[PDB]
């Protein structure tokens, strides 16, 4: 490949969760160990099962792998670090401060932002270490800090004083400032770091990774690489129309890549049929009738309990918008009123159908404009009082995903209120962290009361998830966060199930088996009511074809 040539000491990875960062990291580590240089693979997901593939148990203590000479493994548990932060920042105040303060501290130091800050703290601890970076020539991490975290950490300003901002986790950063300054300088220096982007060959994932690359370039990183992982071999589509459609879409995505990413060196990794579970599988990486309930049952249930909101939620690039459009169109077909408030300005799903259908309506909310408006509105509140440094720190904080989600939710609140006895399908619900924080802080923009959302009879938060390991685990994490917030997701929607589709080729068959395992797990111990949506061969961008989703 083009990204394993005379590589520097450190080597990070980053991309959408579940695109194969761990597999590529392990393969690169194995190859470098075979070359002759000592490496130190550092996994990040606690449930990665990295130790399983290598054949040895891996923990917080560095442990050599006997199978591969000159290979050392290590693990960082961001959840453990976050729990430690909460315990050592809350215990001293517990039992002496009012319950409201304790609740606020607990909420602020919890959620995705806290885990990201803890992960960067552990990364900095590994970097600029006494002998960790002096004994092992190469270190190959498995997930890199987001641009927001890097921007926050290098910014100066007192951190010993942590309304919806996410500057709480920075208060738990015990180490000296010079430590993180040196860590960030080492990370940004092209001589030491070679950040690698891994992104599936799809439009949404490519645009997301392009945005992350733009952020990282803004930070200061100069040289990067791209590794498009997930290309389906052309010959695999010899006699399967679904395989032909998949290959056509993948090739179209490759042909039209975002302009910003064109200059970067690019690589391709074929989807090897052999399942990546053993050492042999990772060595060569770089070189059925499913009968499960469809969306008909979900639509019937919603139809039975009408005058309710159907607010999807899930990590980006899992087809939330298309599913919301399909549900809204199906409900409109029955004659019941719907208000499909999608938030995808890039493409139109229900265009030209508003006038054709008597009762259907739409409201296109642009997340970028809403985020910018919220940022501007909050800059002049709590900005004048703060000194220049404080204002800069707050402005940097307000670029987090939490701010964008809060802005989107606030923009959606007015749509909710203007709709009474009428269905309202959403596009992107706020996570549990945002709901809890906005409810605790609040006790022109106005947000819907948490009372309505928590009510089982007026808020059916469906959770859309792709059918793979990591997407399922992160969706389960989101469900746990929502349950902490007090709202119970009503059902689950597994999307893009090749097994549900007609697959008659080797690679598609293996993927279908894996997704069947995931669906079984989801039905067993994640959701009491789940629906599987197949991978439609034709892209669902029309109005009459959307019914294909609801009536496979
Ligand atoms: N090039 C590839 N060929 C075949 N399978 C792959 C490839 N890349 C990733 N996978 C599959 O993806 C699954 C999960 O990938 P993972 O390493 O967890 O990505 P991430 O670390 O981003 O979640 C693995 O079980 C593996 O089989
Ligand atoms: N059930 C499905 N079958 C096939 N493709 C799908 C399905 N759902 C979504 N997609 C594809 O996924 C792409 C991106 O999904 P999108 O809905 O934009 O994600 P988000 O909800 O984060 O906006 C779309 O271009 C769409 O064609
Ligand atoms: Mg992973
Ligand atoms: Mg969307």
PDB file of N, CA, C and O in Angstrom, residues 76-148:
ATOM      1  N   UNK A  76      -6.302   0.648  25.759  1.00  0.00           N
ATOM      2  CA  UNK A  76      -6.777   1.833  26.462  1.00  0.00           C
ATOM      3  C   UNK A  76      -8.289   1.720  26.567  1.00  0.00           C
ATOM      4  O   UNK A  76      -8.975   1.555  25.551  1.00  0.00           O
ATOM      5  N   UNK A  77      -8.809   1.810  27.791  1.00  0.00           N
ATOM      6  CA  UNK A  77     -10.239   1.684  28.052  1.00  0.00           C
ATOM      7  C   UNK A  77     -10.811   3.068  28.332  1.00  0.00           C
ATOM      8  O   UNK A  77     -10.839   3.510  29.490  1.00  0.00           O
ATOM      9  N   UNK A  78     -11.278   3.794  27.313  1.00  0.00           N
ATOM     10  CA  UNK A  78     -11.787   5.151  27.568  1.00  0.00           C
ATOM     11  C   UNK A  78     -12.943   5.190  28.549  1.00  0.00           C
ATOM     12  O   UNK A  78     -13.054   6.151  29.319  1.00  0.00           O
ATOM     13  N   UNK A  79     -13.812   4.178  28.548  1.00  0.00           N
ATOM     14  CA  UNK A  79     -14.913   4.164  29.505  1.00  0.00           C
ATOM     15  C   UNK A  79     -14.395   4.065  30.935  1.00  0.00           C
ATOM     16  O   UNK A  79     -14.921   4.725  31.840  1.00  0.00           O
ATOM     17  N   UNK A  80     -13.369   3.244  31.159  1.00  0.00           N
ATOM     18  CA  UNK A  80     -12.786   3.150  32.493  1.00  0.00           C
ATOM     19  C   UNK A  80     -12.202   4.485  32.929  1.00  0.00           C
ATOM     20  O   UNK A  80     -12.369   4.902  34.081  1.00  0.00           O
ATOM     21  N   UNK A  81     -11.510   5.174  32.019  1.00  0.00           N
ATOM     22  CA  UNK A  81     -10.946   6.476  32.358  1.00  0.00           C
ATOM     23  C   UNK A  81     -12.043   7.488  32.661  1.00  0.00           C
ATOM     24  O   UNK A  81     -11.906   8.304  33.579  1.00  0.00           O
ATOM     25  N   UNK A  82     -13.136   7.458  31.898  1.00  0.00           N
ATOM     26  CA  UNK A  82     -14.240   8.375  32.161  1.00  0.00           C
ATOM     27  C   UNK A  82     -14.876   8.096  33.517  1.00  0.00           C
ATOM     28  O   UNK A  82     -15.197   9.026  34.268  1.00  0.00           O
ATOM     29  N   UNK A  83     -15.070   6.818  33.847  1.00  0.00           N
ATOM     30  CA  UNK A  83     -15.624   6.476  35.152  1.00  0.00           C
ATOM     31  C   UNK A  83     -14.687   6.913  36.269  1.00  0.00           C
ATOM     32  O   UNK A  83     -15.138   7.390  37.315  1.00  0.00           O
ATOM     33  N   UNK A  84     -13.376   6.754  36.069  1.00  0.00           N
ATOM     34  CA  UNK A  84     -12.417   7.222  37.064  1.00  0.00           C
ATOM     35  C   UNK A  84     -12.494   8.734  37.232  1.00  0.00           C
ATOM     36  O   UNK A  84     -12.445   9.247  38.357  1.00  0.00           O
ATOM     37  N   UNK A  85     -12.601   9.468  36.121  1.00  0.00           N
ATOM     38  CA  UNK A  85     -12.755  10.917  36.202  1.00  0.00           C
ATOM     39  C   UNK A  85     -13.981  11.280  37.024  1.00  0.00           C
ATOM     40  O   UNK A  85     -13.915  12.118  37.931  1.00  0.00           O
ATOM     41  N   UNK A  86     -15.119  10.657  36.714  1.00  0.00           N
ATOM     42  CA  UNK A  86     -16.341  10.963  37.451  1.00  0.00           C
ATOM     43  C   UNK A  86     -16.186  10.631  38.928  1.00  0.00           C
ATOM     44  O   UNK A  86     -16.604  11.407  39.794  1.00  0.00           O
ATOM     45  N   UNK A  87     -15.576   9.486  39.236  1.00  0.00           N
ATOM     46  CA  UNK A  87     -15.454   9.067  40.628  1.00  0.00           C
ATOM     47  C   UNK A  87     -14.549  10.005  41.415  1.00  0.00           C
ATOM     48  O   UNK A  87     -14.851  10.338  42.567  1.00  0.00           O
ATOM     49  N   UNK A  88     -13.438  10.440  40.824  1.00  0.00           N
ATOM     50  CA  UNK A  88     -12.486  11.280  41.541  1.00  0.00           C
ATOM     51  C   UNK A  88     -12.798  12.767  41.423  1.00  0.00           C
ATOM     52  O   UNK A  88     -12.097  13.578  42.038  1.00  0.00           O
ATOM     53  N   UNK A  89     -13.819  13.146  40.653  1.00  0.00           N
ATOM     54  CA  UNK A  89     -14.306  14.517  40.646  1.00  0.00           C
ATOM     55  C   UNK A  89     -15.663  14.677  41.315  1.00  0.00           C
ATOM     56  O   UNK A  89     -16.111  15.815  41.498  1.00  0.00           O
ATOM     57  N   UNK A  90     -16.326  13.582  41.681  1.00  0.00           N
ATOM     58  CA  UNK A  90     -17.631  13.648  42.314  1.00  0.00           C
ATOM     59  C   UNK A  90     -17.599  13.189  43.768  1.00  0.00           C
ATOM     60  O   UNK A  90     -18.350  13.726  44.590  1.00  0.00           O
ATOM     61  N   UNK A  91     -16.763  12.214  44.111  1.00  0.00           N
ATOM     62  CA  UNK A  91     -16.714  11.686  45.454  1.00  0.00           C
ATOM     63  C   UNK A  91     -16.419  12.746  46.496  1.00  0.00           C
ATOM     64  O   UNK A  91     -17.083  12.823  47.535  1.00  0.00           O
ATOM     65  N   UNK A  92     -15.414  13.588  46.243  1.00  0.00           N
ATOM     66  CA  UNK A  92     -15.105  14.655  47.210  1.00  0.00           C
ATOM     67  C   UNK A  92     -16.272  15.589  47.477  1.00  0.00           C
ATOM     68  O   UNK A  92     -16.389  16.111  48.592  1.00  0.00           O
ATOM     69  N   UNK A  93     -17.141  15.820  46.487  1.00  0.00           N
ATOM     70  CA  UNK A  93     -18.276  16.722  46.672  1.00  0.00           C
ATOM     71  C   UNK A  93     -19.553  15.994  47.065  1.00  0.00           C
ATOM     72  O   UNK A  93     -20.510  16.643  47.516  1.00  0.00           O
ATOM     73  N   UNK A  94     -19.602  14.673  46.915  1.00  0.00           N
ATOM     74  CA  UNK A  94     -20.805  13.929  47.259  1.00  0.00           C
ATOM     75  C   UNK A  94     -21.045  13.971  48.762  1.00  0.00           C
ATOM     76  O   UNK A  94     -20.111  13.866  49.562  1.00  0.00           O
ATOM     77  N   UNK A  95     -22.310  14.129  49.145  1.00  0.00           N
ATOM     78  CA  UNK A  95     -22.686  14.175  50.541  1.00  0.00           C
ATOM     79  C   UNK A  95     -22.494  15.517  51.212  1.00  0.00           C
ATOM     80  O   UNK A  95     -22.811  15.644  52.402  1.00  0.00           O
ATOM     81  N   UNK A  96     -21.987  16.518  50.495  1.00  0.00           N
ATOM     82  CA  UNK A  96     -21.813  17.856  51.056  1.00  0.00           C
ATOM     83  C   UNK A  96     -22.417  18.948  50.190  1.00  0.00           C
ATOM     84  O   UNK A  96     -22.646  20.066  50.687  1.00  0.00           O
ATOM     85  N   UNK A  97     -22.704  18.694  48.919  1.00  0.00           N
ATOM     86  CA  UNK A  97     -23.277  19.670  48.010  1.00  0.00           C
ATOM     87  C   UNK A  97     -24.716  19.300  47.668  1.00  0.00           C
ATOM     88  O   UNK A  97     -25.111  18.135  47.773  1.00  0.00           O
ATOM     89  N   UNK A  98     -25.529  20.271  47.254  1.00  0.00           N
ATOM     90  CA  UNK A  98     -26.932  19.967  46.951  1.00  0.00           C
ATOM     91  C   UNK A  98     -27.054  18.986  45.795  1.00  0.00           C
ATOM     92  O   UNK A  98     -26.191  18.911  44.918  1.00  0.00           O
ATOM     93  N   UNK A  99     -28.148  18.221  45.811  1.00  0.00           N
ATOM     94  CA  UNK A  99     -28.339  17.181  44.805  1.00  0.00           C
ATOM     95  C   UNK A  99     -28.303  17.746  43.391  1.00  0.00           C
ATOM     96  O   UNK A  99     -27.882  17.050  42.460  1.00  0.00           O
ATOM     97  N   UNK A 100     -28.746  18.990  43.203  1.00  0.00           N
ATOM     98  CA  UNK A 100     -28.718  19.582  41.868  1.00  0.00           C
ATOM     99  C   UNK A 100     -27.289  19.712  41.354  1.00  0.00           C
ATOM    100  O   UNK A 100     -27.011  19.409  40.187  1.00  0.00           O
ATOM    101  N   UNK A 101     -26.371  20.164  42.208  1.00  0.00           N
ATOM    102  CA  UNK A 101     -24.978  20.302  41.793  1.00  0.00           C
ATOM    103  C   UNK A 101     -24.391  18.940  41.447  1.00  0.00           C
ATOM    104  O   UNK A 101     -23.664  18.794  40.456  1.00  0.00           O
ATOM    105  N   UNK A 102     -24.683  17.926  42.262  1.00  0.00           N
ATOM    106  CA  UNK A 102     -24.168  16.588  41.990  1.00  0.00           C
ATOM    107  C   UNK A 102     -24.709  16.074  40.664  1.00  0.00           C
ATOM    108  O   UNK A 102     -23.973  15.487  39.862  1.00  0.00           O
ATOM    109  N   UNK A 103     -26.004  16.277  40.416  1.00  0.00           N
ATOM    110  CA  UNK A 103     -26.593  15.841  39.155  1.00  0.00           C
ATOM    111  C   UNK A 103     -25.940  16.545  37.974  1.00  0.00           C
ATOM    112  O   UNK A 103     -25.624  15.913  36.958  1.00  0.00           O
ATOM    113  N   UNK A 104     -25.729  17.858  38.088  1.00  0.00           N
ATOM    114  CA  UNK A 104     -25.095  18.588  37.004  1.00  0.00           C
ATOM    115  C   UNK A 104     -23.679  18.116  36.739  1.00  0.00           C
ATOM    116  O   UNK A 104     -23.274  17.946  35.586  1.00  0.00           O
ATOM    117  N   UNK A 105     -22.907  17.893  37.803  1.00  0.00           N
ATOM    118  CA  UNK A 105     -21.539  17.415  37.636  1.00  0.00           C
ATOM    119  C   UNK A 105     -21.537  16.036  36.993  1.00  0.00           C
ATOM    120  O   UNK A 105     -20.740  15.757  36.087  1.00  0.00           O
ATOM    121  N   UNK A 106     -22.427  15.150  37.446  1.00  0.00           N
ATOM    122  CA  UNK A 106     -22.499  13.816  36.863  1.00  0.00           C
ATOM    123  C   UNK A 106     -22.838  13.883  35.381  1.00  0.00           C
ATOM    124  O   UNK A 106     -22.231  13.182  34.564  1.00  0.00           O
ATOM    125  N   UNK A 107     -23.810  14.719  35.014  1.00  0.00           N
ATOM    126  CA  UNK A 107     -24.209  14.796  33.614  1.00  0.00           C
ATOM    127  C   UNK A 107     -23.103  15.389  32.752  1.00  0.00           C
ATOM    128  O   UNK A 107     -22.829  14.886  31.655  1.00  0.00           O
ATOM    129  N   UNK A 108     -22.452  16.453  33.227  1.00  0.00           N
ATOM    130  CA  UNK A 108     -21.436  17.113  32.414  1.00  0.00           C
ATOM    131  C   UNK A 108     -20.272  16.177  32.119  1.00  0.00           C
ATOM    132  O   UNK A 108     -19.769  16.137  30.990  1.00  0.00           O
ATOM    133  N   UNK A 109     -19.834  15.410  33.116  1.00  0.00           N
ATOM    134  CA  UNK A 109     -18.712  14.496  32.970  1.00  0.00           C
ATOM    135  C   UNK A 109     -19.127  13.141  32.409  1.00  0.00           C
ATOM    136  O   UNK A 109     -18.418  12.151  32.618  1.00  0.00           O
ATOM    137  N   UNK A 110     -20.260  13.072  31.718  1.00  0.00           N
ATOM    138  CA  UNK A 110     -20.743  11.836  31.125  1.00  0.00           C
ATOM    139  C   UNK A 110     -21.157  12.093  29.686  1.00  0.00           C
ATOM    140  O   UNK A 110     -21.546  13.207  29.325  1.00  0.00           O
ATOM    141  N   UNK A 111     -21.071  11.053  28.867  1.00  0.00           N
ATOM    142  CA  UNK A 111     -21.440  11.127  27.468  1.00  0.00           C
ATOM    143  C   UNK A 111     -20.236  10.953  26.558  1.00  0.00           C
ATOM    144  O   UNK A 111     -19.110  10.719  26.997  1.00  0.00           O
ATOM    145  N   UNK A 112     -20.506  11.091  25.259  1.00  0.00           N
ATOM    146  CA  UNK A 112     -19.477  10.832  24.257  1.00  0.00           C
ATOM    147  C   UNK A 112     -18.295  11.780  24.408  1.00  0.00           C
ATOM    148  O   UNK A 112     -17.138  11.375  24.241  1.00  0.00           O
ATOM    149  N   UNK A 113     -18.562  13.051  24.715  1.00  0.00           N
ATOM    150  CA  UNK A 113     -17.476  14.018  24.825  1.00  0.00           C
ATOM    151  C   UNK A 113     -16.494  13.621  25.919  1.00  0.00           C
ATOM    152  O   UNK A 113     -15.276  13.745  25.744  1.00  0.00           O
ATOM    153  N   UNK A 114     -17.002  13.147  27.056  1.00  0.00           N
ATOM    154  CA  UNK A 114     -16.110  12.721  28.128  1.00  0.00           C
ATOM    155  C   UNK A 114     -15.240  11.554  27.682  1.00  0.00           C
ATOM    156  O   UNK A 114     -14.042  11.514  27.987  1.00  0.00           O
ATOM    157  N   UNK A 115     -15.822  10.589  26.967  1.00  0.00           N
ATOM    158  CA  UNK A 115     -15.027   9.463  26.488  1.00  0.00           C
ATOM    159  C   UNK A 115     -13.954   9.927  25.513  1.00  0.00           C
ATOM    160  O   UNK A 115     -12.823   9.434  25.549  1.00  0.00           O
ATOM    161  N   UNK A 116     -14.289  10.867  24.626  1.00  0.00           N
ATOM    162  CA  UNK A 116     -13.289  11.374  23.689  1.00  0.00           C
ATOM    163  C   UNK A 116     -12.157  12.086  24.421  1.00  0.00           C
ATOM    164  O   UNK A 116     -10.976  11.898  24.095  1.00  0.00           O
ATOM    165  N   UNK A 117     -12.494  12.909  25.415  1.00  0.00           N
ATOM    166  CA  UNK A 117     -11.457  13.602  26.175  1.00  0.00           C
ATOM    167  C   UNK A 117     -10.576  12.598  26.903  1.00  0.00           C
ATOM    168  O   UNK A 117      -9.349  12.743  26.945  1.00  0.00           O
ATOM    169  N   UNK A 118     -11.183  11.570  27.498  1.00  0.00           N
ATOM    170  CA  UNK A 118     -10.396  10.553  28.187  1.00  0.00           C
ATOM    171  C   UNK A 118      -9.490   9.805  27.218  1.00  0.00           C
ATOM    172  O   UNK A 118      -8.336   9.497  27.541  1.00  0.00           O
ATOM    173  N   UNK A 119     -10.000   9.489  26.027  1.00  0.00           N
ATOM    174  CA  UNK A 119      -9.180   8.808  25.034  1.00  0.00           C
ATOM    175  C   UNK A 119      -7.984   9.662  24.643  1.00  0.00           C
ATOM    176  O   UNK A 119      -6.861   9.155  24.527  1.00  0.00           O
ATOM    177  N   UNK A 120      -8.197  10.963  24.440  1.00  0.00           N
ATOM    178  CA  UNK A 120      -7.059  11.818  24.123  1.00  0.00           C
ATOM    179  C   UNK A 120      -6.100  11.928  25.299  1.00  0.00           C
ATOM    180  O   UNK A 120      -4.887  12.034  25.098  1.00  0.00           O
ATOM    181  N   UNK A 121      -6.617  11.924  26.528  1.00  0.00           N
ATOM    182  CA  UNK A 121      -5.736  11.950  27.691  1.00  0.00           C
ATOM    183  C   UNK A 121      -4.836  10.723  27.717  1.00  0.00           C
ATOM    184  O   UNK A 121      -3.629  10.829  27.965  1.00  0.00           O
ATOM    185  N   UNK A 122      -5.405   9.547  27.454  1.00  0.00           N
ATOM    186  CA  UNK A 122      -4.593   8.335  27.421  1.00  0.00           C
ATOM    187  C   UNK A 122      -3.605   8.364  26.259  1.00  0.00           C
ATOM    188  O   UNK A 122      -2.465   7.899  26.393  1.00  0.00           O
ATOM    189  N   UNK A 123      -4.020   8.903  25.111  1.00  0.00           N
ATOM    190  CA  UNK A 123      -3.098   9.027  23.988  1.00  0.00           C
ATOM    191  C   UNK A 123      -1.918   9.918  24.349  1.00  0.00           C
ATOM    192  O   UNK A 123      -0.767   9.595  24.032  1.00  0.00           O
ATOM    193  N   UNK A 124      -2.182  11.046  25.008  1.00  0.00           N
ATOM    194  CA  UNK A 124      -1.097  11.930  25.419  1.00  0.00           C
ATOM    195  C   UNK A 124      -0.209  11.257  26.456  1.00  0.00           C
ATOM    196  O   UNK A 124       1.013  11.441  26.447  1.00  0.00           O
ATOM    197  N   UNK A 125      -0.804  10.480  27.361  1.00  0.00           N
ATOM    198  CA  UNK A 125      -0.002   9.745  28.332  1.00  0.00           C
ATOM    199  C   UNK A 125       0.941   8.776  27.634  1.00  0.00           C
ATOM    200  O   UNK A 125       2.114   8.660  28.008  1.00  0.00           O
ATOM    201  N   UNK A 126       0.447   8.068  26.615  1.00  0.00           N
ATOM    202  CA  UNK A 126       1.317   7.173  25.857  1.00  0.00           C
ATOM    203  C   UNK A 126       2.391   7.955  25.113  1.00  0.00           C
ATOM    204  O   UNK A 126       3.553   7.533  25.061  1.00  0.00           O
ATOM    205  N   UNK A 127       2.024   9.091  24.525  1.00  0.00           N
ATOM    206  CA  UNK A 127       2.992   9.948  23.862  1.00  0.00           C
ATOM    207  C   UNK A 127       3.863  10.662  24.892  1.00  0.00           C
ATOM    208  O   UNK A 127       3.485  10.833  26.054  1.00  0.00           O
ATOM    209  N   UNK A 128       5.047  11.075  24.449  1.00  0.00           N
ATOM    210  CA  UNK A 128       5.997  11.795  25.294  1.00  0.00           C
ATOM    211  C   UNK A 128       6.179  11.077  26.629  1.00  0.00           C
ATOM    212  O   UNK A 128       6.213  11.686  27.701  1.00  0.00           O
ATOM    213  N   UNK A 129       6.298   9.755  26.552  1.00  0.00           N
ATOM    214  CA  UNK A 129       6.428   8.900  27.722  1.00  0.00           C
ATOM    215  C   UNK A 129       7.914   8.640  27.922  1.00  0.00           C
ATOM    216  O   UNK A 129       8.721   8.860  27.014  1.00  0.00           O
ATOM    217  N   UNK A 130       8.266   8.175  29.121  1.00  0.00           N
ATOM    218  CA  UNK A 130       9.657   7.996  29.517  1.00  0.00           C
ATOM    219  C   UNK A 130      10.334   7.019  28.561  1.00  0.00           C
ATOM    220  O   UNK A 130      11.325   7.372  27.912  1.00  0.00           O
ATOM    221  N   UNK A 131       9.817   5.795  28.461  1.00  0.00           N
ATOM    222  CA  UNK A 131      10.437   4.755  27.648  1.00  0.00           C
ATOM    223  C   UNK A 131       9.458   4.094  26.693  1.00  0.00           C
ATOM    224  O   UNK A 131       9.885   3.309  25.836  1.00  0.00           O
ATOM    225  N   UNK A 132       8.161   4.388  26.801  1.00  0.00           N
ATOM    226  CA  UNK A 132       7.194   3.754  25.910  1.00  0.00           C
ATOM    227  C   UNK A 132       7.468   4.100  24.453  1.00  0.00           C
ATOM    228  O   UNK A 132       7.388   3.226  23.582  1.00  0.00           O
ATOM    229  N   UNK A 133       7.787   5.362  24.168  1.00  0.00           N
ATOM    230  CA  UNK A 133       8.079   5.809  22.814  1.00  0.00           C
ATOM    231  C   UNK A 133       9.561   5.743  22.476  1.00  0.00           C
ATOM    232  O   UNK A 133       9.947   6.135  21.370  1.00  0.00           O
ATOM    233  N   UNK A 134      10.399   5.267  23.396  1.00  0.00           N
ATOM    234  CA  UNK A 134      11.829   5.129  23.156  1.00  0.00           C
ATOM    235  C   UNK A 134      12.269   3.695  22.916  1.00  0.00           C
ATOM    236  O   UNK A 134      13.287   3.479  22.256  1.00  0.00           O
ATOM    237  N   UNK A 135      11.529   2.713  23.431  1.00  0.00           N
ATOM    238  CA  UNK A 135      11.871   1.308  23.243  1.00  0.00           C
ATOM    239  C   UNK A 135      11.222   0.721  21.998  1.00  0.00           C
ATOM    240  O   UNK A 135      11.843  -0.089  21.301  1.00  0.00           O
ATOM    241  N   UNK A 136       9.986   1.111  21.705  1.00  0.00           N
ATOM    242  CA  UNK A 136       9.280   0.663  20.512  1.00  0.00           C
ATOM    243  C   UNK A 136       9.374   1.737  19.438  1.00  0.00           C
ATOM    244  O   UNK A 136       8.961   2.881  19.655  1.00  0.00           O
ATOM    245  N   UNK A 137       9.917   1.362  18.279  1.00  0.00           N
ATOM    246  CA  UNK A 137      10.122   2.324  17.203  1.00  0.00           C
ATOM    247  C   UNK A 137       8.809   2.803  16.601  1.00  0.00           C
ATOM    248  O   UNK A 137       8.702   3.972  16.216  1.00  0.00           O
ATOM    249  N   UNK A 138       7.809   1.929  16.509  1.00  0.00           N
ATOM    250  CA  UNK A 138       6.547   2.247  15.858  1.00  0.00           C
ATOM    251  C   UNK A 138       5.397   2.038  16.830  1.00  0.00           C
ATOM    252  O   UNK A 138       5.389   1.074  17.600  1.00  0.00           O
ATOM    253  N   UNK A 139       4.430   2.949  16.792  1.00  0.00           N
ATOM    254  CA  UNK A 139       3.184   2.820  17.535  1.00  0.00           C
ATOM    255  C   UNK A 139       2.040   3.012  16.553  1.00  0.00           C
ATOM    256  O   UNK A 139       2.039   3.975  15.778  1.00  0.00           O
ATOM    257  N   UNK A 140       1.076   2.105  16.581  1.00  0.00           N
ATOM    258  CA  UNK A 140      -0.023   2.089  15.618  1.00  0.00           C
ATOM    259  C   UNK A 140      -1.315   2.124  16.421  1.00  0.00           C
ATOM    260  O   UNK A 140      -1.845   1.086  16.825  1.00  0.00           O
ATOM    261  N   UNK A 141      -1.845   3.321  16.644  1.00  0.00           N
ATOM    262  CA  UNK A 141      -3.111   3.450  17.345  1.00  0.00           C
ATOM    263  C   UNK A 141      -4.260   2.994  16.449  1.00  0.00           C
ATOM    264  O   UNK A 141      -4.096   2.756  15.250  1.00  0.00           O
ATOM    265  N   UNK A 142      -5.442   2.853  17.047  1.00  0.00           N
ATOM    266  CA  UNK A 142      -6.626   2.411  16.326  1.00  0.00           C
ATOM    267  C   UNK A 142      -7.739   3.435  16.180  1.00  0.00           C
ATOM    268  O   UNK A 142      -8.706   3.169  15.458  1.00  0.00           O
ATOM    269  N   UNK A 143      -7.642   4.582  16.843  1.00  0.00           N
ATOM    270  CA  UNK A 143      -8.616   5.649  16.678  1.00  0.00           C
ATOM    271  C   UNK A 143      -7.950   6.955  17.071  1.00  0.00           C
ATOM    272  O   UNK A 143      -7.243   7.015  18.079  1.00  0.00           O
ATOM    273  N   UNK A 144      -8.177   7.993  16.276  1.00  0.00           N
ATOM    274  CA  UNK A 144      -7.475   9.245  16.478  1.00  0.00           C
ATOM    275  C   UNK A 144      -8.404  10.294  17.074  1.00  0.00           C
ATOM    276  O   UNK A 144      -9.623  10.227  16.895  1.00  0.00           O
ATOM    277  N   UNK A 145      -7.861  11.275  17.791  1.00  0.00           N
ATOM    278  CA  UNK A 145      -8.709  12.343  18.326  1.00  0.00           C
ATOM    279  C   UNK A 145      -9.394  13.111  17.208  1.00  0.00           C
ATOM    280  O   UNK A 145      -8.820  13.332  16.140  1.00  0.00           O
ATOM    281  N   UNK A 146     -10.632  13.521  17.461  1.00  0.00           N
ATOM    282  CA  UNK A 146     -11.334  14.368  16.512  1.00  0.00           C
ATOM    283  C   UNK A 146     -10.744  15.775  16.527  1.00  0.00           C
ATOM    284  O   UNK A 146     -10.064  16.184  17.472  1.00  0.00           O
ATOM    285  N   UNK A 147     -11.013  16.522  15.457  1.00  0.00           N
ATOM    286  CA  UNK A 147     -10.469  17.866  15.359  1.00  0.00           C
ATOM    287  C   UNK A 147     -10.902  18.752  16.511  1.00  0.00           C
ATOM    288  O   UNK A 147     -10.129  19.582  16.996  1.00  0.00           O
ATOM    289  N   UNK A 148     -12.144  18.585  16.966  1.00  0.00           N
ATOM    290  CA  UNK A 148     -12.653  19.407  18.058  1.00  0.00           C
ATOM    291  C   UNK A 148     -11.822  19.217  19.322  1.00  0.00           C
ATOM    292  O   UNK A 148     -11.461  20.191  19.996  1.00  0.00           O
TER     293      UNK A 148
END
